[PDB]
Amino acid sequence: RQEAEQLKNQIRDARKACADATLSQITNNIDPVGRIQMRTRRTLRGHLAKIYAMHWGTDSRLLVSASQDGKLIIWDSYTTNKVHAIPLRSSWVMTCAYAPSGNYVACGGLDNICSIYNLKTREGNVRVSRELAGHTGYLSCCRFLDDNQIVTSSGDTTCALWDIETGQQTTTFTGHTGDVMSLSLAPDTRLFVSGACDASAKLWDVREGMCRQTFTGHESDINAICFFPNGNAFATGSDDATCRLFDLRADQELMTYSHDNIICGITSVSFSKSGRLLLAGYDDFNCNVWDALKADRAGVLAGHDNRVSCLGVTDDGMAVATGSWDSFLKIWN
Amino acid sequence: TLSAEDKAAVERSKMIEKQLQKERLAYKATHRLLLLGADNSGKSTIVKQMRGIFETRFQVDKVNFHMFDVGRRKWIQCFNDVTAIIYVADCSDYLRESLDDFESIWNNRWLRTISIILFLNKQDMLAEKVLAGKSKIEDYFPEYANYTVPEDATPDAGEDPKVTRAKFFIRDLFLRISTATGDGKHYCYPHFTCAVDTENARRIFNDCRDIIQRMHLKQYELL
C-alpha cells in the first residue's frame, strides 16, 4: 500500500511537471465559429416507444434505429422509405451497430446477449447469424471491427473482443470499478477507449488486451465517450453536466465544457467530421453544439419533446441524426 | 418524376407502415407492470399463480397485462411507462430494511408519478407466529403494546385481536411513509395476501382501473 501510494504521489507529481500551458491562452487567436443554425429536413416516424440507439452507414445514406418495443428499423435517409423492419426477441435493447461492409447489423440489451443479423441474404427476410452470450450484466455498447471481430462493453465490469464464426470470447478486458457505460474505437483500428460508472476512462489494446492508460478528472459516472478524428484525443460526458477533453500522448485533461444553466446529465457526445464541433445530448429536451477549441456554445438543436438518447454524425459530415424518447428521429443539416 | 422502381420502393414502405400501425394499436391496449421485491419475498408463488428478464403474460376479463421482473440505480430509467408496480414485502418475520427500500423506491426520480400496489405477503404465518406467544414482533419496534386500533377496523375474520394490532401497525407504518410526501402525486394500494390464496389478479384488475379512470377525470377537467 505504501509502495502504491509512493507511486501515486509520484505519478501525480510527475504529471504536474508535464503541463506547461493551458488551452484557452493558446487558442485565443482562433476566431470563434459563431452562431450555427440547423433545420430539420426529415422526421422518421414509425417507432412505437422511446428509441435508445442509432448508427449511421458507411455509404452515408442508410441508417439503423432501435426502440424499446422490440424494433430495429433500417431507414433510407433521402426518400424516408423503410427498407427493413426487424423484430427483436427482447424488448429492452440499448445498443445497435451497423457493419462497415453493410452486410450485418448488431443489437443487444438486458437479454445478456448480442445478436448479429445477416442483411444481404438470398431472400427478402433478415435472419439471425450469430448469438453471442458470455456476459452476466446488461450490454451498453457493441462495435464492429470487421465482418468477424466485434467489441462489446457490458455491465459486468468486463469488455470482450469476440470471434463470430465460433461464438466464444477471445480477449477479455478487466480493471473497471463499476459497470461499463460507453466505448469507442480508434480510426487507426489499433486501440479503443472505454468509460464506466467510476468517473474514470480507460484505454485498452486490441491484441494483447491490457489497460495501457487511465484518466480521471470527473466527479460522477460517464455516460458517453467518443474519439477525435485524429486518433490522439477523445471526449467524455458525465452525469454532473460536464464534458471533458482527454489526450493520449499528453496523458492529462485538456479542457472542460459546462455552463451554469445546465443541471441535467449528458447522454451522448459526438464529433464532426473535421473535429471542430462537439454535439452533446442532454435531458432538458435539448441537444447542444460546442466549439471544441474555445469551449463556447454555438447553437441549440431544439425541437424535441423529451430527452435526446442517441446522436450520430454521418461519415462525410453532411448531416446529423438525433433520436429521443418521443420516438421521432430528426435529421439536421 | 418517380421511376419504375421508386414506385415499388414507396409501395413497399407503405406496406411496412401498415403493419407498424397495426402494432401501435395493439401496443396501446396493453398495460405493463414492473415487479420489484426483496430476495426472500414470495414473488415466485404469485408469478406462478398468475402465469434476466422474467416475464408474465396473464390476462383478465378480455384485457391483457404483461408483468416483468428484472435481474438498480442504472436500469430504473427504462421503467417509467408502466401503469403501476406490484411491490411485495415480507410480513410474518423480521423490516427496517424493507421500509428503507420502500422509502427509496417511493421517492425515485424516474419512478415518480406512478402509483404503487403493495402486497403484504404471507400473513398466514403471522397468525401462528402470534399464536405461539413468546416475543412475536414487539422486540424490534417497542410500540405494538402502545398502539391501539380504532373501532373502524372491521376485521375480515376477527379470529384474534392480537394479530389485528400486529397487521395494522405495520400497515400504518407503510401507509404513513406513503402519505408523508408526494403532493397527491400517486397513491399506495395495500393488501394482505398469502401464498396459498387464489386471486391476487382481480385485485390487480380492480386496481389500475381506478388510476386510469382518475387520469381520465383529470383530463376532462372535472377533478
Epitope: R61, E123, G124, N125 | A4, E5, A8, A9, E11, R12
Partner: single-chain antibody, 233 residues
Framework: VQLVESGGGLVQPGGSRKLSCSAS????????MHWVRQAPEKGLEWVAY????????YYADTVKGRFTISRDDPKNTLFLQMTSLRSEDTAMYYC??????????????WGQGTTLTVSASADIVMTQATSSVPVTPGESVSISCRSS???????????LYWFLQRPGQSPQLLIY???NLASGVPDRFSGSGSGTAFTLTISRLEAEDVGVYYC?????????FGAGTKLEL
C-alpha cells in the same frame, strides 16, 4: 430458390389455357413477379407484371385485355389465365422474380419455362449492333448496344440489364444498372455506358461463355428486350 412451371402443350385456335408457376425455397410475399415469353426462333418479350400485395398490375400493349394474372400467397403459387389464343401466342414462357428497394437486384432469378403451341406505340427500342462475333479463348469481347433515348435519370440511376442465355438453359443475370456485378458471376465481365451507347466487355474468355447476350431497360414500364448477339467458339 426454385421456380417450376406447369401447363402448356398443343392447343386449338380460340381456346383458353391456365399456366401455374410455383415457388418453393424463398419468401414469396416480398417479391414481385413477371412473365416473359420467347418465340421458337426469336428473342424475349414481356407479358405481365404483378406487385407484392397485388396493389399494382401491368400488361403488354399487345395483349392488354386478353390475359389475367393472380397469385395465392397462402397456397404459395402464382398463375395466369390465357384467352383468345392468336397465332402469335405460340412460345415458351418463364416466370421471373424481382424485389425493389434501395440497392436490390431485380430479375435476379429465372424459372425453367414451359412451352405453349397453337395449332392451325411509343416504347423504347434497343438495337444490338453486331448479331454474331467470332472469338477465341483468352481474348476480349466488346459487345455493344444502342438505345433510342438516354436511360439515365435525374438521380443518376441507369436501368440497363445484361442477360446471358446458354444453349439449353434459361437466361441468367450478369449486370444490373449497367455497372453492378451480379452475385455469382466472375470478375471477368464488366459493363459501361454513357446514357445511350452501352458496352459489355469481357477480358478473358473460357468455355462456358457460349450463348446469346440480351439487353433490357427498366425506365418506362413497357420494357423491351432486344434482338441479341450470338457468341461461338
Amino acid at each position: 430458390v426454385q421456380l417450376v412451371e406447369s401447363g402448356g402443350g398443343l392447343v386449338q385456335p380460340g381456346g383458353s389455357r391456365k399456366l401455374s408457376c410455383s415457388a418453393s425455397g424463398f419468401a414469396f410475399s416480398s417479391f414481385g413477379m413477371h412473365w416473359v415469353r420467347q418465340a421458337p426462333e426469336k428473342g424475349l418479350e414481356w407479358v405481365a407484371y404483378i406487385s407484392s400485395g397485388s396493389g399494382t398490375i401491368y400488361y403488354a400493349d399487345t395483349v392488354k385485355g386478353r390475359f389475367t394474372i393472380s397469385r395465392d400467397d397462402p397456397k404459395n403459387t402464382l398463375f395466369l389465365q390465357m384467352t383468345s389464343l392468336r397465332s402469335e401466342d405460340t412460345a415458351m414462357y418463364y416466370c421471373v422474380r424481382s424485389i425493389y428497394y434501395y440497392g436490390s437486384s431485380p430479375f435476379d432469378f429465372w424459372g425453367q419455362g414451359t412451352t405453349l403451341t397453337v395449332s392451325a406505340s411509343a416504347d423504347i427500342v434497343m438495337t444490338q449492333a453486331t448479331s454474331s462475333v467470332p472469338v477465341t479463348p483468352g481474348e476480349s469481347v466488346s459487345i455493344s448496344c444502342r438505345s433510342s433515348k438516354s436511360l439515365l435519370h435525374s438521380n443518376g440511376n441507369t436501368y440497363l440489364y445484361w442477360f446471358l442465355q446458354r444453349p439449353g438453359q434459361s437466361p441468367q443475370l450478369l449486370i444490373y444498372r449497367m455497372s453492378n456485378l451480379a452475385s455469382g458471376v466472375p470478375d471477368r465481365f464488366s459493363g459501361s455506358g454513357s446514357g445511350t451507347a452501352f458496352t459489355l466487355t469481357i477480358s478473358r474468355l473460357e468455355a462456358e461463355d457460349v450463348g446469346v447476350y440480351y439487353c433490357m431497360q427498366h425506365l418506362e414500364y413497357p420494357l423491351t428486350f432486344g434482338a441479341g448477339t450470338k457468341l461461338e467458339l
